[PDB]
């Protein structure tokens, strides 16, 4: 989705 729910955590910090 457009909420950075596809990262390596839950803060849009460290997304692949």
Curated annotation (Swiss-Prot):
Cysteines engaged in disulfide bonds, as pairs: 4-12, 7-15
Superkingdom of source: Eukaryota
Name recorded for this polypeptide: Uroguanylin
Species whose genome carries this gene: Homo sapiens (Human)
Gene: GUCA2B
Residues of the full protein shown: 97 to 112 of 112
